[PDB]
Enzyme design. Structure first.
Site: not given
Ligand SMILES: Nc1ncnc2c1ncn2[C@@H]1O[C@H](COP(=O)(O)OP(=O)(O)OP(=O)(O)O)[C@@H](O)[C@H]1O
Ligand SMILES: [Ca+2]
Ligand SMILES: [Ca+2]
Ligand SMILES: N#Cc1ccccc1CSc1nc2c(=O)nc(N)[nH]c2[nH]1
Ligand SMILES: [Ca+2]
Ligand SMILES: [Ca+2]
Length: 155
Positions: A85, A89, A92, A94
């Site tokens: 990553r 992407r 991912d 979450d």
């Molecule tokens: N529940 C969570 N799971 C994973 N990461 C999280 C969570 N809450 C906050 N974060 C933070 O989110 C930041 C950004 O991650 P990222 O760029 O992957 O967002 P995304 O997955 O693209 O968008 P979305 O959250 O809207 O799905 C990470 O650096 C992490 O610290």
């Molecule tokens: Ca994410």
């Molecule tokens: Ca996401």
């Protein structure tokens, strides 16, 4: 300390993503003090976002763990980075839910802030946790009965 069930969303939309996802599952299963209880089916979802890109492979995993929530985040971030990553992407991960906990810190917001609006999160979740109740008391089944979400196709 007692085990908590965490629910993690998986997404990849590489033009060929099945290998990212399978590699992620193996890595998630090797996390210390943690064990995969269940994996959803894999779903092919049309990409949401402005740019022309491939379809996502979306899935959900139930991971029983005695790690602290931020420690689990450390592992999911390490896995994303170790699998290639690169921020501009591939993968991912979450954290949707961490048991009943409500977490609002700089690095970590649980429940995932938008998951109640995402069919590609809620349908895989329902497959693996049909009796789930959110921390605020909302029932997963009631959300999916009431709100309009497209059904997902399997990958
Ligand atoms: N529940 C969570 N799971 C994973 N990461 C999280 C969570 N809450 C906050 N974060 C933070 O989110 C930041 C950004 O991650 P990222 O760029 O992957 O967002 P995304 O997955 O693209 O968008 P979305 O959250 O809207 O799905 C990470 O650096 C992490 O610290
Ligand atoms: Ca994410
Ligand atoms: Ca996401
Ligand atoms: N902009 C954007 C946007 C819009 C809606 C939800 C999430 C995002 C954030 S990026 C994104 N992630 C995924 C995914 O996992 N699955 C599908 N189908 N589309 C996706 N888009
Ligand atoms: Ca939305
Ligand atoms: Ca909630």
């Amino acid at each position: 300390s007692a085990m908590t069930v965490a629910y993690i969303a998986i997404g990849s939309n590489l033009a060929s993503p099945l290998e990212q996802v399978n590699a992620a599952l193996k890595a998630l299963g090797d996390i210390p003090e943690s064990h995969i209880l269940t994996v959803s089916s894999f779903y092919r979802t049309p990409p949401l976002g402005p740019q022309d890109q491939p379809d996502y492979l979306n899935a959900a995993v139930a991971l029983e763990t005695s790690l602290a929530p931020e420690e689990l985040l450390n592992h999911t971030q390490r896995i994303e980075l170790q699998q290639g990553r690169v921020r501009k992407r591939t993968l991912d991960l979450d954290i949707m839910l961490f048991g009943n906990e409500v977490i609002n810190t700089e690095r970590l917001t649980v429940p995932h802030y938008d998951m109640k609006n995402r069919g590609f999160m809620l349908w895989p979740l329902f497959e693996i946790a049909p009796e789930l109740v959110f921390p605020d008391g909302e029932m997963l089944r009631q959300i999916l009965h009431t709100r309009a979400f497209d059904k997902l196709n399997k990958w």
